[PDB]
Amino acid sequence: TSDQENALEGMKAFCANSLDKNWPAALLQGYAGTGKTTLLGVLVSSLVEKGYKVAVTAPTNKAVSVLMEKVPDASCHATIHSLLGLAGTSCVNDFDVVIVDECSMIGADLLSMIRGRPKFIFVGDPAQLPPVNEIFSPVFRSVGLRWSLSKIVRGNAIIDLSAEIRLKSEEGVPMTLEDIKSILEGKLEACCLVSALTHEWKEGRDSRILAWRNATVDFYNRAIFSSLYPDATTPFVPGQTAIVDTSEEVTILSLEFLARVQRASGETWTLRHPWAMTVHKAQGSTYDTVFVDWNDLRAIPSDDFLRILYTAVTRPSRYLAICH
Amino acid sequence: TSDQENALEGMKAFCANSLDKNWPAALLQGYAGTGKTTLLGVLVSSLVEKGYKVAVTAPTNKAVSVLMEKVPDASCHATIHSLLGLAGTSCVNDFDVVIVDECSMIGADLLSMIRGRPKFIFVGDPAQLPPVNEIFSPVFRSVGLRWSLSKIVRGNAIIDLSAEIRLKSEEGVPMTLEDIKSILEGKLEACCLVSALTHEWKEGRDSRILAWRNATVDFYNRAIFSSLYPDATTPFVPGQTAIVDTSEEVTILSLEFLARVQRASGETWTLRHPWAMTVHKAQGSTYDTVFVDWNDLRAIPSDDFLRILYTAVTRPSRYLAICH
């Protein structure tokens, strides 16, 4: 690869203090289909082989949960709040290299309290949404070392649609459903809901709908709750997966204004459906195969488009479907 | 070079339509001492040798005047307002490649009316000041192709001070005059005013002082006017160089509420001293050897520092001096 190895060779030397010292920063800036989360495996493998103490970190629990499968050579997979005790005790000084991930939603306060003795590396995508009440992630305003990856390298349709969306974003012509149909013809990786994903859930596979909030994702969740379990005697059902750490999926083991929440894998404890949801809560978390409701994203927004569509087309891992 | 050739190979192919089409954008993002204005010579030479019709453009007349010496192989060195007739006639369609320069001060309106049939390439530095009433240049928010250069490659002191300023910018420790003295000891490329640069002007060399405005650059200009010409019979003197196109130096040939302004080189016509000036008006324009008044930049600003100091240390070409 052209950009990938250039970005790697130089981070692999900035970590080893080959460059000038007192630089506690870096950047990657990959778009999609680039090794924005692929070259990190090689980097972490090399650093562990070098004898360092690396930590792979993410702002959300779902992102680091994915990273566990993506990066099986790190040491302290944790949330950004758990490596510094921000909200137990800060364990950051025990590490030599910190590799932050999905930094596109990282707020300014995280940069303010990201200080530490190890070398911090940031990974993000400038084409995704910025954090709430904030227009462009401050990590991209980094004045120190920088790197950039702008390709779609490696017969695919999940990322080709995102590339087309980005292409139409930099020029004035908008993107309308006829363009979607004309680009999604023959690829057959898109189907350009309630019963379909209910049948999916009967088989076991779980999906989601990337609609807006406060008006759609409750009507698009109560229907699935009624259809999947015909009898509704309790707000939840044993064996169901639930949502709220932050934005972490939990299992349900029993009930009773009382409930039970099996957290993590084996951690049972005591104390939001996972089907209908919003693109904002989707940022950073893949949620596997997902369906996209075009009639919601096209209707209300008029300026954020081509950026809401991005970060919504990149969520699915193998199957995407747009419904009109 | 590592980053330079990677940035070149890829622009040299995006221009030739080797990549995907309908991408009317690019980026370079060099800091200082990088080939942010050096690899452009090679690029333009290759494109002219390829048979294209390239145009080297800048938002200010001083920047393109410098580019004429830096780039002697272009075809239509002009202001950004002259290649599109924004304010005669737009000549942009006659060109195949447009290479914009010093894009760090380019406003959003320039991106809005930058549309055209040729392929537009943007060059800028994220570490410099943003355009007025605007926090971060929209060109860096480009979603299309991107490139980055972050080095100080190629016993020098004019850019080493800027590198140190940037290094102190990304961490919480500020930079104070004792640090300036400790870094500027033995380098002897800095002297860490009125009489000194008046003696400079008697010899012929002209310098400047990068102070603030509305309070300092008038007292720091009237004194030089009185000292350089002991008798003050007219606001200007024949043979003097003057300032205000926009931010373009002109000569004075005669006077008479009447005057004469020899514009350009040979263009005589009819109708701000060049000594004391502001860092804002300094952006993009080198103004050769310059002196920097530390007591002005240190006193009033408290947040913009390390960014006002940048774009003020990079203005001089061969000699820098800081006075306290």
XYZ file of C-alpha atoms in Angstrom:
648
model
C 0.000 0.000 0.000
C 1.152 3.557 -0.710
C -0.302 5.662 2.112
C -0.496 2.868 4.703
C 3.211 2.047 4.925
C 4.137 5.742 4.841
C 1.824 6.356 7.795
C 3.156 3.292 9.643
C 6.863 4.005 9.171
C 7.010 7.218 11.170
C 4.576 6.292 13.901
C 6.719 3.210 14.502
C 9.631 5.665 14.854
C 7.851 8.436 16.785
C 6.905 5.885 19.444
C 10.539 4.733 19.722
C 11.691 8.350 20.337
C 13.650 8.373 17.069
C 12.147 11.780 16.242
C 12.226 14.890 18.422
C 10.999 14.355 21.971
C 8.216 16.147 23.884
C 5.654 15.297 21.180
C 2.722 13.609 22.980
C 0.495 13.327 19.908
C 0.002 11.851 16.436
C -2.761 11.333 13.878
C -3.831 8.833 11.219
C -6.888 10.282 9.398
C -8.154 7.390 7.311
C -11.486 7.514 5.513
C -12.972 4.049 4.873
C -11.612 0.839 3.382
C -8.203 2.218 4.347
C -6.257 0.550 7.123
C -7.482 3.066 9.690
C -8.213 0.031 11.893
C -6.018 -2.498 10.041
C -2.485 -1.084 10.235
C -3.070 -0.666 13.978
C -2.832 -4.439 14.322
C 0.631 -4.420 12.760
C 1.654 -1.410 14.856
C 0.535 -2.980 18.142
C 2.116 -6.322 17.224
C 5.438 -4.610 16.499
C 5.275 -2.546 19.697
C 4.504 -5.605 21.844
C 7.325 -7.485 20.117
C 9.522 -4.459 20.885
C 8.812 -4.914 24.604
C 6.600 -1.865 25.158
C 3.399 -1.694 27.227
C 0.716 -0.633 24.754
C -2.941 0.069 25.483
C -5.713 0.037 22.879
C -8.457 2.410 23.983
C -11.802 3.680 22.704
C -14.351 6.218 24.004
C -17.171 3.632 24.031
C -17.436 0.073 25.293
C -18.781 -1.300 21.997
C -15.817 0.108 20.062
C -13.255 -1.460 22.396
C -15.286 -4.688 22.420
C -14.879 -4.786 18.640
C -11.202 -3.842 18.999
C -10.673 -6.899 21.210
C -11.442 -9.091 18.201
C -9.649 -6.737 15.799
C -6.576 -6.323 18.033
C -5.739 -9.539 19.936
C -2.211 -8.420 20.926
C -2.861 -5.357 23.116
C -2.676 -5.426 26.912
C -5.249 -3.101 28.498
C -8.315 -2.818 26.257
C -10.376 -0.278 28.195
C -12.561 2.789 27.892
C -10.926 6.215 27.701
C -12.429 6.914 31.134
C -10.953 3.721 32.619
C -7.311 4.284 31.638
C -7.280 7.536 33.635
C -10.006 7.027 36.244
C -12.093 9.893 34.865
C -15.829 10.138 35.504
C -11.147 4.677 39.849
C -7.375 5.138 39.737
C -5.310 6.261 36.755
C -3.164 3.426 35.383
C -1.887 5.422 32.394
C 1.669 5.876 33.700
C 2.164 2.092 33.661
C 2.043 2.157 29.839
C 4.595 3.366 27.302
C 2.299 3.808 24.269
C -1.405 4.704 24.273
C -3.341 4.081 21.049
C -6.687 5.879 21.128
C -9.335 4.893 18.577
C -12.474 6.406 17.034
C -11.250 9.860 18.028
C -13.686 11.654 15.696
C -16.175 12.015 18.582
C -13.530 12.852 21.212
C -14.362 16.167 22.862
C -11.990 18.925 23.905
C -12.104 17.880 27.570
C -10.627 14.505 26.628
C -7.681 16.288 25.004
C -7.373 18.498 28.090
C -7.187 15.512 30.472
C -5.328 13.195 28.071
C -1.977 14.263 29.556
C 0.387 11.519 30.666
C 3.915 10.193 30.462
C 3.334 7.678 27.585
C 3.087 8.613 23.900
C -0.514 9.059 22.743
C -1.580 8.147 19.197
C -4.957 9.238 17.827
C -6.951 7.494 15.090
C -10.012 9.011 13.448
C -11.872 9.847 10.253
C -12.532 13.493 9.278
C -15.543 12.528 7.136
C -17.695 11.302 10.046
C -19.882 13.323 12.390
C -18.293 15.607 14.991
C -19.088 15.323 18.710
C -22.297 16.912 19.926
C -22.360 20.705 20.367
C -19.078 20.820 18.461
C -18.363 21.363 14.776
C -15.010 19.671 14.038
C -13.055 17.378 16.324
C -10.134 19.230 17.974
C -7.869 16.211 17.434
C -7.717 17.176 13.753
C -6.425 20.605 14.839
C -3.291 18.861 16.127
C -0.162 20.925 15.508
C 2.353 18.127 16.134
C 2.943 15.056 13.990
C 0.317 14.130 11.403
C -0.523 11.450 8.858
C -3.300 10.966 6.318
C -4.915 8.064 4.450
C -7.330 8.899 1.602
C -8.178 5.768 -0.409
C -10.887 3.122 -0.732
C -8.444 0.369 -1.691
C -10.076 -3.075 -1.521
C -15.887 -5.828 -6.013
C -17.343 -4.300 -2.854
C -20.505 -2.269 -2.305
C -20.712 -1.372 1.401
C -17.875 1.163 1.125
C -18.400 2.128 -2.533
C -21.657 3.849 -1.581
C -19.791 5.816 1.095
C -17.139 6.780 -1.461
C -19.870 8.014 -3.817
C -21.507 9.966 -0.978
C -18.184 11.640 -0.204
C -17.654 12.366 -3.906
C -21.032 14.101 -4.142
C -20.298 15.942 -0.869
C -17.371 18.016 -2.176
C -19.368 19.225 -5.204
C -22.687 21.047 -5.280
C -24.834 18.295 -6.806
C -26.854 16.491 -4.098
C -27.574 12.762 -3.977
C -31.151 11.571 -4.474
C -32.817 8.152 -4.403
C -32.592 7.670 -8.180
C -28.813 7.997 -7.874
C -28.981 5.426 -5.064
C -30.909 3.000 -7.269
C -28.631 3.549 -10.274
C -25.513 2.893 -8.186
C -27.159 -0.033 -6.331
C -28.022 -2.149 -9.369
C -26.135 -5.387 -9.930
C -24.122 -4.994 -6.727
C -27.050 -6.635 -4.886
C -25.480 -5.871 -1.507
C -28.374 -3.459 -0.899
C -32.146 -3.915 -1.074
C -33.041 -0.516 -2.545
C -38.718 -3.626 8.050
C -40.544 -4.720 11.199
C -41.522 -8.148 9.866
C -38.217 -8.617 8.032
C -35.980 -8.047 11.034
C -38.443 -9.877 13.294
C -37.896 -12.897 11.049
C -34.181 -12.134 11.350
C -34.457 -12.207 15.151
C -36.367 -15.502 15.121
C -33.405 -16.975 13.241
C -31.118 -15.351 15.847
C -29.459 -12.570 13.857
C -30.147 -9.083 15.200
C -30.224 -5.905 13.112
C -31.045 -2.218 13.558
C -32.712 0.747 11.863
C -30.749 4.010 11.670
C -33.611 6.476 11.984
C -33.877 9.728 13.946
C -34.928 9.956 17.609
C -37.832 11.144 19.772
C -40.321 10.415 16.977
C -39.469 7.171 15.138
C -37.311 4.725 17.124
C -40.002 4.121 19.740
C -42.685 3.236 17.189
C -40.033 1.162 15.400
C -39.178 -0.680 18.636
C -42.537 -1.327 20.308
C -43.759 -3.010 17.116
C -40.774 -5.373 17.082
C -41.239 -6.043 20.795
C -44.873 -7.006 20.196
C -44.118 -9.125 17.121
C -41.079 -10.978 18.493
C -42.839 -11.840 21.760
C -46.606 -11.956 21.076
C -47.417 -11.658 24.791
C -46.169 -8.519 26.560
C -46.436 -9.128 30.305
C -43.248 -7.315 31.375
C -41.221 -4.418 29.938
C -38.422 -6.919 29.254
C -38.157 -10.683 28.828
C -35.503 -13.098 30.164
C -32.863 -13.813 27.544
C -33.351 -10.411 25.904
C -30.437 -8.086 25.183
C -30.750 -4.502 26.405
C -28.968 -1.156 26.122
C -28.015 0.812 29.276
C -20.566 2.425 31.466
C -22.299 4.025 28.477
C -23.788 2.461 25.336
C -22.917 -1.070 26.462
C -25.188 -4.000 25.675
C -26.275 -6.172 28.607
C -28.184 -9.430 28.952
C -31.360 -9.986 30.969
C -31.467 -12.971 33.329
C -34.544 -12.344 35.502
C -36.968 -9.638 36.611
C -38.069 -8.615 40.105
C -39.667 -1.857 39.785
C -36.891 -4.431 40.119
C -34.676 -6.203 37.604
C -31.385 -8.008 36.949
C -28.610 -7.010 34.544
C -25.876 -9.504 33.673
C -23.062 -7.127 32.730
C -19.960 -7.835 30.630
C -19.601 -11.579 30.133
C -19.698 -13.274 33.540
C -20.389 -10.290 35.804
C -23.909 -10.611 37.208
C -25.416 -7.552 38.896
C -28.724 -6.011 39.982
C -30.581 -2.808 39.136
C -33.468 0.849 25.732
C -34.148 -1.941 23.253
C -31.279 -2.840 20.879
C -33.344 -2.776 17.656
C -34.496 0.780 16.862
C -31.807 3.390 17.363
C -30.190 6.591 16.094
C -27.130 7.241 13.921
C -25.716 9.447 16.691
C -25.632 6.498 19.095
C -24.353 4.404 16.172
C -21.109 6.370 15.857
C -18.101 4.171 16.595
C -20.239 1.053 17.187
C -20.704 -1.233 14.184
C -23.897 -3.089 15.225
C -23.268 -5.583 12.389
C -25.879 -5.864 9.629
C -28.150 -2.830 9.669
C -31.077 -1.440 7.701
C -31.268 2.263 6.869
C -34.550 4.186 6.707
C -34.027 6.660 3.867
C -37.365 8.423 4.392
C -36.109 9.669 7.776
C -32.602 10.852 6.867
C -33.772 12.508 3.643
C -36.784 14.342 5.073
C -35.777 16.455 8.084
C -32.067 17.237 7.457
C -31.149 19.646 4.678
C -27.519 20.616 5.442
C -26.017 17.765 7.490
C -26.779 15.332 4.646
C -23.910 13.465 2.944
C -22.430 13.416 6.453
C -25.344 11.755 8.233
C -25.444 9.300 5.317
C -21.779 8.712 6.012
C -21.277 7.071 9.431
C -24.594 5.385 8.636
C -23.447 3.479 5.545
C -20.185 2.482 7.287
C -21.911 0.956 10.336
C -22.829 -2.391 8.685
C -20.108 -5.022 8.421
C -21.413 -7.309 5.652
C -25.008 -6.401 4.677
C -26.659 -3.027 4.045
C -30.255 -2.265 3.058
C -31.960 1.024 2.204
C -35.762 1.150 2.280
C -38.008 3.671 0.534
C 12.310 12.609 1.421
C 9.698 10.374 3.052
C 6.516 12.466 3.156
C 7.340 14.688 0.167
C 7.522 11.991 -2.508
C 4.462 10.227 -1.078
C 2.506 13.478 -1.338
C 3.824 14.142 -4.858
C 3.146 10.687 -6.299
C -0.628 10.757 -6.008
C -1.188 14.393 -6.849
C 0.776 13.758 -10.042
C -1.715 10.921 -10.661
C -4.900 12.646 -9.456
C -4.238 15.454 -11.937
C -3.814 12.931 -14.777
C -7.229 11.364 -13.962
C -5.580 8.074 -12.972
C -7.742 7.986 -9.831
C -11.531 8.233 -9.671
C -12.994 11.202 -11.522
C -15.272 13.992 -10.240
C -12.788 14.911 -7.488
C -12.146 18.673 -7.843
C -9.949 18.983 -4.751
C -6.718 17.982 -3.007
C -4.568 19.055 -0.062
C -0.909 19.211 0.964
C -0.756 20.390 4.616
C 2.917 21.103 5.184
C 4.166 22.864 8.296
C 7.505 24.652 7.768
C 10.841 23.611 6.295
C 8.831 20.966 4.447
C 8.422 21.243 0.701
C 5.027 22.909 1.050
C 6.321 25.434 -1.509
C 9.226 23.347 -2.876
C 7.614 20.194 -4.281
C 5.200 22.490 -6.132
C 8.060 23.460 -8.431
C 8.594 19.821 -9.392
C 4.843 19.280 -9.766
C 4.365 22.297 -12.044
C 7.459 21.406 -14.078
C 6.149 17.873 -14.622
C 2.659 19.116 -15.515
C 4.010 21.649 -18.028
C 6.251 18.947 -19.495
C 3.128 16.759 -19.679
C 1.452 19.374 -21.892
C -1.134 20.670 -19.418
C -2.138 24.304 -18.832
C -1.332 24.943 -15.175
C -1.962 28.121 -13.199
C -0.181 29.051 -9.968
C -2.478 31.240 -7.892
C -2.458 32.980 -4.513
C -5.019 35.068 -2.588
C -2.647 38.060 -2.332
C -0.433 39.855 -4.824
C 2.696 39.613 -2.655
C 2.357 35.829 -2.377
C 2.057 35.350 -6.138
C 4.878 37.863 -6.660
C 7.069 35.608 -4.520
C 5.733 32.545 -6.357
C 6.918 34.051 -9.651
C 10.496 33.700 -8.414
C 9.765 30.385 -6.683
C 7.853 28.918 -9.650
C 9.313 30.055 -13.002
C 7.491 27.394 -15.068
C 3.807 28.252 -14.523
C 1.684 30.076 -17.096
C -0.863 32.386 -15.449
C 0.483 33.660 -12.123
C -2.492 35.678 -10.883
C -4.608 36.506 -7.866
C -7.458 34.178 -6.908
C -9.834 36.991 -7.893
C -8.217 37.386 -11.329
C -8.476 33.759 -12.484
C -12.271 33.914 -12.105
C -13.073 37.617 -12.487
C -14.423 37.861 -8.939
C -14.620 41.177 -7.096
C -13.094 41.018 -15.359
C -13.777 37.762 -17.196
C -13.199 34.246 -15.883
C -10.316 32.527 -17.686
C -10.368 29.425 -15.469
C -11.832 27.076 -18.096
C -8.769 27.640 -20.302
C -6.635 25.752 -17.750
C -6.428 22.045 -16.954
C -4.838 22.242 -13.477
C -5.208 25.034 -10.910
C -2.673 25.116 -8.063
C -3.857 27.419 -5.282
C -1.340 28.524 -2.649
C -1.390 29.896 0.906
C -4.895 28.507 1.353
C -4.793 28.827 5.157
C -6.487 32.250 4.910
C -8.926 31.227 2.151
C -12.489 31.892 3.275
C -15.568 29.773 2.678
C -16.790 32.027 -0.144
C -13.644 31.217 -2.119
C -14.463 27.510 -1.838
C -18.055 28.272 -2.851
C -16.991 30.126 -6.022
C -13.915 27.977 -6.736
C -15.961 25.728 -9.044
C -14.585 25.087 -12.515
C -13.733 22.447 -15.075
C -9.985 22.096 -14.196
C -8.627 20.154 -11.213
C -7.979 22.381 -8.193
C -5.112 21.662 -5.784
C -4.891 23.429 -2.421
C -1.713 24.101 -0.431
C -1.716 25.359 3.145
C -0.397 25.013 6.681
C -2.755 24.097 9.560
C -0.452 25.704 12.149
C -0.897 29.280 10.878
C -3.666 31.745 11.663
C -7.167 31.192 10.268
C -8.973 33.831 8.192
C -10.647 36.662 10.058
C -13.989 35.950 11.765
C -13.320 32.259 11.178
C -11.735 29.635 13.411
C -10.263 26.960 11.105
C -9.886 27.140 7.345
C -12.623 25.122 5.580
C -10.074 23.783 3.081
C -8.781 21.510 5.850
C -12.325 20.120 6.185
C -11.942 18.681 2.678
C -13.583 15.269 2.357
C -11.901 14.269 -0.917
C -8.233 13.484 -1.461
C -5.746 14.537 1.214
C -2.027 14.610 1.941
C 0.087 15.696 4.901
C 3.677 16.809 5.522
C 4.854 17.095 9.152
C 8.636 17.568 9.309
C 11.247 20.304 9.695
C 13.800 18.534 7.500
C 16.676 20.853 6.546
C 22.050 24.001 11.313
C 19.148 26.419 10.905
C 17.488 28.752 13.400
C 14.667 30.596 11.605
C 12.476 27.477 11.473
C 13.822 25.768 14.613
C 12.195 28.469 16.744
C 8.883 27.812 14.980
C 9.290 24.078 15.605
C 9.891 24.771 19.305
C 6.844 27.060 19.423
C 4.709 24.310 17.898
C 6.173 21.780 20.343
C 5.222 23.963 23.311
C 1.784 24.569 21.745
C 0.548 20.966 21.983
C 1.481 20.719 25.684
C 0.361 22.914 28.561
C 3.688 24.599 29.342
C 3.817 28.115 27.828
C 6.863 29.738 26.238
C 8.470 32.712 27.980
C 11.384 35.001 27.120
C 13.905 32.998 29.165
C 13.092 29.985 26.986
C 13.609 32.242 23.955
C 17.034 33.313 25.217
C 18.072 29.762 26.128
C 17.113 28.463 22.678
C 18.608 31.526 20.919
C 22.150 31.218 22.267
C 24.926 30.234 19.883
C 22.584 30.138 16.888
C 23.164 33.905 16.529
C 20.462 34.165 13.864
C 18.432 36.211 16.364
C 19.274 39.319 18.388
C 17.424 38.405 21.591
C 14.490 49.310 16.431
C 13.770 52.709 14.889
C 17.422 53.715 14.534
C 18.526 50.195 13.586
C 16.132 49.766 10.683
C 16.581 53.418 9.694
C 20.271 52.604 9.265
C 19.112 49.527 7.350
C 17.034 51.730 5.034
C 19.929 54.134 4.444
C 21.912 51.132 3.203
C 18.877 50.184 1.068
C 17.578 47.078 2.833
C 14.033 47.421 4.161
C 12.635 45.579 7.179
C 9.453 45.516 9.260
C 8.160 45.230 12.823
C 5.414 42.675 13.511
C 3.504 44.531 16.209
C -0.243 44.910 16.778
C -2.410 47.596 15.148
C -4.327 50.771 16.026
C -1.896 51.553 18.858
C 1.716 50.756 17.881
C 2.371 50.655 14.119
C 1.639 54.358 13.664
C 4.077 55.466 16.369
C 6.528 52.921 14.938
C 6.105 54.369 11.428
C 6.011 58.143 11.936
C 9.322 57.935 13.809
C 10.978 56.097 10.914
C 9.456 58.565 8.454
C 10.940 61.475 10.410
C 14.347 59.826 10.859
C 14.779 58.537 7.296
C 13.797 61.882 5.760
C 14.651 64.636 8.283
C 12.372 67.133 6.518
C 8.682 66.207 6.290
C 7.072 68.513 3.730
C 4.671 65.988 2.163
C 2.925 62.837 3.423
C 5.080 60.852 0.979
C 8.370 61.400 -0.838
C 9.320 60.552 -4.449
C 11.136 57.233 -4.641
C 9.340 55.899 -1.559
C 7.566 52.541 -1.558
C 3.976 52.492 -0.317
C 1.230 50.017 0.575
C -2.265 50.350 -0.975
C -5.560 44.977 -5.787
C -4.994 44.434 -2.061
C -1.783 44.440 -0.007
C 0.373 45.230 -3.043
C 3.435 47.443 -2.756
C 3.647 50.409 -5.135
C 6.297 52.995 -5.948
C 5.915 56.772 -5.718
C 7.019 58.854 -8.708
C 5.572 62.322 -8.026
C 2.970 64.165 -5.962
C 0.254 66.598 -7.048
C -4.923 65.974 -2.451
C -3.286 64.551 -5.573
C -0.625 61.910 -6.135
C 0.899 59.357 -8.518
C 1.180 55.592 -8.043
C 3.443 53.562 -10.325
C 1.764 50.159 -10.097
C 3.232 46.730 -10.882
C 6.536 47.157 -12.696
C 5.990 49.435 -15.699
C 2.334 50.385 -15.219
C 2.141 54.067 -14.280
C -1.168 55.368 -12.927
C -2.719 58.225 -10.947
C -4.670 58.469 -7.697
C 0.258 52.966 4.420
C 4.013 52.972 4.957
C 5.816 49.642 4.382
C 7.800 49.650 7.655
C 5.464 49.253 10.652
C 2.784 46.635 10.145
C 0.734 43.825 11.687
C 1.140 40.038 11.673
C -2.377 39.735 10.230
C -1.346 41.675 7.122
C 1.902 39.671 7.189
C 0.157 36.348 6.557
C 1.237 34.846 3.239
C 3.656 37.711 2.469
C 7.276 37.140 3.480
C 8.512 40.768 3.675
C 12.101 39.443 3.849
C 14.158 40.226 6.960
C 11.881 41.309 9.789
C 12.154 42.321 13.433
C 9.623 41.081 15.982
C 8.468 43.176 18.945
C 8.013 40.640 21.742
C 6.604 43.176 24.213
C 3.537 43.568 21.972
C 2.743 39.928 21.169
C 3.342 38.790 24.753
C 1.327 41.507 26.496
C -2.210 41.684 25.082
C -2.856 38.128 23.776
C -3.332 35.318 26.274
C -4.914 32.496 24.218
C -3.901 33.068 20.581
C -0.221 32.861 21.584
C 1.991 30.129 20.080
C -0.112 30.741 16.965
C 0.517 34.472 16.627
C 4.190 33.692 17.287
C 3.914 31.211 14.453
C 3.260 32.991 11.131
C 5.413 35.729 12.659
C 8.617 33.699 13.005
C 8.118 32.193 9.520
C 7.799 35.572 7.762
C 11.561 36.344 7.617
C 13.591 34.673 4.883
C 17.163 34.909 6.221
C 17.329 37.104 9.358
C 15.097 37.246 12.443
C 15.390 39.474 15.514
C 13.359 39.567 18.727
C 13.586 42.677 20.906
C 12.742 42.952 24.603
